[PDB]
Amino acid sequence: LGAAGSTMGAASITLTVQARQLLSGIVQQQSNLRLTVWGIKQLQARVLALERYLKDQQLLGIWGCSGKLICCTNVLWNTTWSNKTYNDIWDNMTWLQWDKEISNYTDIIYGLIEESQIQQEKNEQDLLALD
């Protein structure tokens, strides 16, 4: 999380860092080697840390971005999702204040992402190779 205050272009240089401390909680406690409050608290926390990871990898999967941390898509960026340029976004703003500016339309984009491409592109792709 070192680049949490850097520009989006600068921050985009350490995505492995955010990737590490999101899935592995088993180095810190693979077991701790029983109805105590601590046992239930620990177990529910360990499940949640991988439960959240599997939701995001699930979204990347159904969007055809399973293998990659950075994937480009075909959906257009509608300018109503704020008018800016490449440099005004990637070299002067941080991902925090960016996520706040685009948090309004994240749902609409997700709906287009799953339908417009990976479901039209793939369905036409299945009908093309399945011929």
């Binding site: 941080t94 991902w95 491409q117």
Partner: protein, 440 residues
């Protein structure tokens, strides 16, 4: 203009999850099973990785941090897990034909049950005046008509142990390293950690013992200063050395109200009949109190007056200093500390302390715990770091200002260690437009 996905963006939001324990594993092969560490607490990290965060402006909130409630829930739960299997003090609420001991303490005589049921036990014991009340005169334990009394096992200790509350992956603990940090609001220096530092569950009223130490100036934190109903909590920068001693050389006697139900009481003590007390260096106390008056004047007019008075009314926990000391519960007359007057410009003081064996803390009607006696003279020492003050309220404004000690809630003690902590959940899904595009 094309949407692009970036998994693992440094973005988070405000939420709360199921935290858990983290304490260094001490074998303690001779004496184990303290309530907080239990049979197993998760071990800590050998190297506490503390990563600072730059250009991070975030508002902390201690008075609305739900971690304090979750800790307060886990404490009461951990206590209840240590009171169920031990002896249920129901074969003890008998008529106590007490005689004045050779006045607090009473030498009582009563009839109990032996290992047999029909065979009854004619035995004696010794308790304090706040343990029984009359109905010579005949006495009965105080909690026999309210909450179920149950003796704790003599193996589980009540000594506080540091707890490092953590958070799983996907969640993070933000630490505000601001020295001059008002309790809430923005913090210029925010850092992130996976676990907290050593926090002792110091079950105490008014005087906070063995707590955290502020930096530079004595920090003053209150949810609302102009509201007298809100309890003001302070955090000192210089730890004092307070000493409480029970100079009574008590003895433990083991009766058998079984089967399996063993009861340890207080027998004929040795040494001297010396009541409980504590010591406070009058010089350092007066020196520390003067710094308090110099810090209280920052929330009041420049040329004013600060008045200190003892406790008004309420229970003996609200009026006297409640705390633990080697197993016994001590309650001290703090009237000699709070009786001064301060304008704009080498001996020690002692406080009369009382000992209670039947505790009813948190005011849970229905359940109760008995403190087993502790052998030998007890001597404990601590560093007082915080205080729970309270205004008097309705009066002519800016005339005089009076401050009295309070203790309306036990959660205020957990606020003294969680003022610079905050749990946030990580949102790694990021969407940003780039000139890049996918294939066909």
């Amino acid at each position: 203009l094309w949407v692009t996905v970036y998994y693992g963006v440094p973005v988070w939001k405000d939420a709360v999850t199921t935290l858990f324990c983290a304490s260094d594993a001490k074998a303690y092969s001779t004496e184990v099973h303290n309530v907080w560490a239990t049979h197993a607490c998760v071990p800590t990290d050998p190297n506490p990785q503390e990563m600072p965060l730059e250009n991070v402006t975030e508002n902390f909130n201690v008075w609305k941090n739900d971690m304090v409630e979750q800790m307060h829930e886990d404490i009461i739960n951990l206590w209840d897990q240590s009171l169920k299997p031990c002896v249920k003090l129901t074969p003890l609420c008998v008529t106590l034909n007490c005689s004045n001991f050779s006045g607090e303490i009473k030498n009582c005589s009563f009839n109990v049950t032996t290992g047999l049921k029909d065979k009854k036990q004619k035995m004696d014991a010794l308790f304090h005046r706040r343990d029984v009340v009359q109905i010579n005169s005949y006495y009965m334990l105080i909690s026999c008509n309210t909450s179920t009394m149950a003796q704790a096992c003599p193996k589980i200790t009540f000594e506080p142990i540091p707890i490092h509350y953590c958070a799983p992956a996907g969640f993070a603990i933000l630490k505000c390293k601001d020295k001059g940090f008002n309790g809430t609001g923005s913090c210029k220096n925010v850092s992130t950690v996976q676990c907290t530092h050593g926090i002792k569950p110091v079950v105490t009223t008014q005087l906070l013992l063995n707590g955290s130490t502020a930096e530079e100036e004595i920090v003053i934190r209150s949810e609302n200063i102009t509201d007298n109903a809100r309890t003001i909590i302070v955090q000192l920068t210089k730890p004092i050395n307070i000493n409480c001693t029970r100079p009574g050389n008590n003895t433990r006697k083991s009766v058998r109200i079984g089967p399996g139900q063993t009861f340890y009481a207080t027998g004929a003590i040795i040494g001297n009949i010396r009541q409980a007390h504590c010591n406070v260096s009058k010089t350092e106390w007066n020196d520390t109190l003067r710094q308090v008056a110099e810090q209280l004047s920052k929330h009041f007019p420049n040329a004013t007056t600060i008045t200190f008075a003892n406790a008004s009314g309420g229970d003996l926990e609200i009026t006297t200093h409640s705390f633990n000391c080697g197993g016994e519960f001590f309650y001290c007359n703090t009237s000699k500390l709070f009786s001064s007057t301060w304008d704009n410009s080498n001996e020690t003081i002692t406080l009369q302390c009382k000992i209670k064996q039947i505790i009813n803390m948190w005011q849970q009607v229905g359940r109760a715990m008995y403190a087993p006696p502790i052998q030998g003279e007890i001597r404990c020492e601590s560093n007082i770091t915080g205080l729970l003050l309270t205004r008097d309220g309705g009066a002519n404004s800016s005339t005089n200002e009076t401050f009295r000690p309070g203790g309306g809630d036990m959660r205020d003690n957990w606020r003294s260690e969680l003022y610079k902590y905050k749990v946030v959940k990580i949102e790694p899904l990021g969407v940003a437009p780039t000139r890049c595009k996918r294939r066909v």
